[PDB]
Design a protein around this ligand. Structure first.
Ligand SMILES: Cc1cc2nc3c(=O)[nH]c(=O)nc-3n(C[C@H](O)[C@H](O)[C@H](O)COP(=O)(O)OP(=O)(O)OC[C@H]3O[C@@H](n4cnc5c(N)ncnc54)[C@@H](O)[C@@H]3O)c2cc1C
Ligand code: HEM
Ligand code: HEM
Ligand code: HEM
Ligand code: HEM
Ligand SMILES: O=C(O)/C=C/C(=O)O
Ligand code: NA
Length: 568
């Protein structure tokens, strides 16, 4: 067989997969996926048959219910979604090599005939609010709009939910929470505001930062009430005290928060549509939102009539061509991002009259795994890891600004560095076990052996850790002025992770006000149009603090949904 359908039709009728009339049920292929499961079992049940020691195509860190058709097409060869960041040894029947070639919004102007036909038809749906993007901002808006009594459709262009938010590790910033208080942490929303303003070089819109800091506690409360565990409170660079909230034991905040939002959306019966890309915001003769043209992968173009459209589409950090035009120093870098994070929602915003701001400010995350090509959380350093160069020396305050950390690492022999840590750090942050499982954290019972394994000067490395640990006990880093020194590296075995900078976060995007209303270049509100999350600019200025994006998407997502529902 050349394809999966051909294989099945040897022994099966068409209607073993299809509805009676043969038409595709919807863009999520709900009915068709239900048929896969009726014969093969759920994803969890399939996973029992495809275990490898350290990975499993059918049991991943992805939240929600991942549809079979995300990777298995019927009538043509298909790609393994996991191939967009990893290179596991897979043998998926009817596989083809991972390639993402999604048309830009501009290229889709060539579908004029089909688009005109769609717009000439009745709206497929008439609702109050359409939310575009199933990341943290979009789920938060969809849920909060629904709880405010609005009828919502939530669309996602990808086959899977969650965007970049499902990848978040280090935490969700907030002050002054019950969770902090339970851990003996003293904080304030004012201190958070002041850290954030300082972190963004005072470029941030102060009114947006005040929403961020002042709503942050309520957003942790809101997530917790919906079932989230945010009780572990870690340290990340640029924060005056521990405020990065995440699940017990230091697990990843992202997959967890997105799973909770997913469960809560399903419980409220929110209409969520996969493989459904927002193309064009529709405006009436007076310039207010009247709906949105969408493109379903399977069902084609159609439009939804709505009073309000919330753009919650994330950043463009995966789009290196667009990144390099704005910041040439990032050209050719690998990204930490999901394959769809290319900025098409910004194109949709601009076409609707929205102005962009702060686009030139793009964050490189200092520590991508050289070996794995994936982000290594700053929480590894926050919890006590150091950085060494190949010479076996520290060379930077590990929790300095991300731009300076990145610059420092690129300045070292080989343009990479090593995270160095022990079992006490490892046990303090369960996320570290994920790096060990990936195979990117080689270990030894001494630093001489470890250095020899990795090409790091082993005597210098030994002496560097002895010297650092002395600095920890005395409570001051007279070498690089690291302001937080939580742990000596002296329990059990030692680990090295080779790391290098990658493109991570785009601080610019659509201008919003404190109501998440999108504004034009004249600073006039576009009535019915909203923006929330990494798609927006102004919140983070010139540099975002770690933990501040998950805070932003929940706060601004929730607020947009409430505002859009009241607008109505
Ligand atoms: C690996 C990684 C780890 C991170 N860790 C942290 C952390 O610990 N703490 C922190 O504060 N920040 C962290 N960040 C930053 C943060 O998770 C992102 O800023 C956040 O994901 C922004 O969420 P969002 O809802 O705006 O967008 P996303 O979560 O990116 O979701 C937007 C969604 O919209 C989509 N979409 C886009 N265009 C369209 C369209 N036209 N139609 C339909 N759908 C569309 C998607 O493809 C995507 O699923 C991390 C980012 C990455 C990449
Ligand atoms: C739904 C679209 C669906 C998918 C996806 C799916 C997957 C799948 C694969 C990857 C194979 C292996 C093919 C190969 O080895 O080349 C496979 C094989 C079998 N399937 Fe299937 N399957 C989907 C749908 C369905 C449905 C609706 C049925 C039955 C009504 C069905 C059953 C089977 C059977 C039997 C096989 C042969 C292997 C076996 O388990 O005995 N699948 N499928
Ligand atoms: C039986 C021989 C059979 C026919 C006929 C058939 C038709 C068909 C069409 C025309 C489409 C495209 C429809 C559109 O674009 O609107 C389509 C798409 C999908 N199919 Fe199919 N199909 C037949 C058999 C099967 C079998 C046995 C399966 C499951 C193993 C299956 C499933 C799917 C799925 C999923 C799609 C969406 C696109 C894709 O994955 O290729 N069909 N089919
Ligand atoms: C596709 C569904 C997919 C699978 C399967 C997968 C597996 C996987 C493993 C086995 C690890 C090691 C840790 C663990 O067992 O959970 C791991 C780690 C990371 N991944 Fe992954 N992964 C899949 C897909 C993707 C894609 C599409 C991305 C990027 C958009 C991605 C990213 C990451 C990152 C970052 C890590 C580091 C550990 C962590 O952050 O938890 N994965 N993945
Ligand atoms: C949906 C629940 C789903 C089903 C059903 C399904 C079926 C399936 C089968 C039957 C196989 C072959 C198992 C065997 O060894 O005989 C198989 C294999 C792979 N799949 Fe699958 N699959 C479902 C969903 C998904 C999704 C969502 C992904 C990608 C994220 C995916 C991918 C893969 C890969 C890769 C393989 C090969 C496994 C390996 O080589 O270890 N599937 N699937
Ligand atoms: O866990 C991290 O490193 C990411 C932090 C952030 O981007 O906010
Ligand atoms: Na942004």
């Amino acid at each position: 067989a050349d394809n999966l359908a051909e294989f099945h039709v040897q022994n099966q009728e068409c209607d073993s997969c299809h509805t009676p009339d043969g038409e595709l049920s919807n863009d999520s292929l709900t009915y068709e996926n239900t048929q896969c499961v009726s014969c093969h079992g759920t994803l969890a049940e399939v996973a029992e048959t495809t275990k490898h020691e350290h990975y499993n195509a059918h049991a991943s860190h992805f939240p929600g219910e991942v549809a079979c058709t995300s990777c298995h097409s019927a009538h043509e060869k298909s790609m393994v979604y996991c191939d967009s960041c990893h290179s596991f040894d897979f043998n998926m029947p009817y596989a083809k090599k991972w390639l993402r070639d999604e048309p830009t919004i501009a290229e889709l102007a060539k579908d004029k005939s089909e688009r005109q036909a769609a717009l000439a038809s009745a709206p497929h749906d008439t609702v109050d609010v359409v939310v575009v993007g199933s990341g943290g901002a979009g789920f938060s808006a969809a849920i909060s709009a629904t709880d405010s009594g609005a009828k919502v459709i939530l669309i996602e262009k990808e086959p899977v939910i969650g965007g970049n938010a499902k990848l978040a590790a280090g935490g969700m910033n907030a002050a002054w929470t019950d969770q902090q208080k339970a851990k003996k942490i003293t904080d304030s929303p004012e201190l958070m505001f002041e850290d954030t303003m300082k972190g963004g070089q005072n470029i941030n819109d102060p009114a947006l930062v005040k929403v961020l800091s002042s709503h942050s506690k309520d957003s942790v409360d809101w997530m917790t009430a919906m079932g989230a565990d945010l009780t572990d409170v870690g340290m990340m660079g640029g924060a005056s005290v521990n405020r990065a909230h995440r699940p017990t034991g230091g697990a990843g905040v992202g997959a967890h928060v997105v799973q909770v939002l997913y469960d809560n959306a399903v419980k409220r019966n929110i209409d969520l549509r996969m493989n459904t890309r927002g193309i064009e915001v529709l405006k009436d003769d007076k310039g207010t939102v009247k709906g949105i043209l969408v493109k379903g992968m399977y069902k084609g173009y159609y439009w939804v009539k709505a009073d309000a459209v919330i753009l919650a589409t994330g950043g463009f950090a995966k789009n290196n061509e667009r990144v390099a035009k704005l910041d040439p120093s990032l050209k050719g870098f690998i990204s930490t991002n999901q394959p769809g994070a290319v900025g098409d929602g910004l194109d949709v915003a601009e076409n609707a009259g929205g102005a962009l701001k702060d686009m030139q400010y793009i964050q490189a995350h200092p520590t991508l795994s050289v070996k794995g090509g994936v982000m290594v959380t700053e929480a590894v350093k926050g919890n006590g890891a150091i950085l060494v160069n190949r010479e076996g020396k520290r060379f930077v305050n590990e929790i300095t600004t991300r731009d300076k950390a990145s610059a420092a690492i690129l300045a070292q022999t080989g343009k990479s560095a090593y995270l160095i840590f022990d079992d006490s750090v490892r046990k303090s942050l369960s996320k570290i076990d994920k790096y060990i499982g990936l195979g990117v954290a080689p270990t030894a019972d001494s630093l001489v052996k470890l250095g020899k394994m990795e090409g790091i000067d082993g005597k210098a490395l030994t002496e560097t850790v002895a010297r650092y640990n002395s600095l920890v006990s005395s409570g001051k880093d007279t070498d690089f002025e690291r302001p937080n020194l939580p742990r000596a590296l002296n329990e059990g075995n030692y680990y090295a992770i080779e790391v290098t900078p990658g493109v991570h976060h785009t601080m610019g995007g659509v201008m919003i006000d404190t109501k998440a209303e999108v504004m034009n270049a004249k600073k006039q509100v576009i009535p019915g149009l909203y923006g929330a999350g990494e798609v927006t600019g102004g919140v983070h200025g010139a540099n975002r603090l770690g933990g501040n994006a998950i805070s932003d998407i929940i706060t601004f997502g929730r607020l947009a949904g409430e505002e859009a529902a009241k607008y109505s």
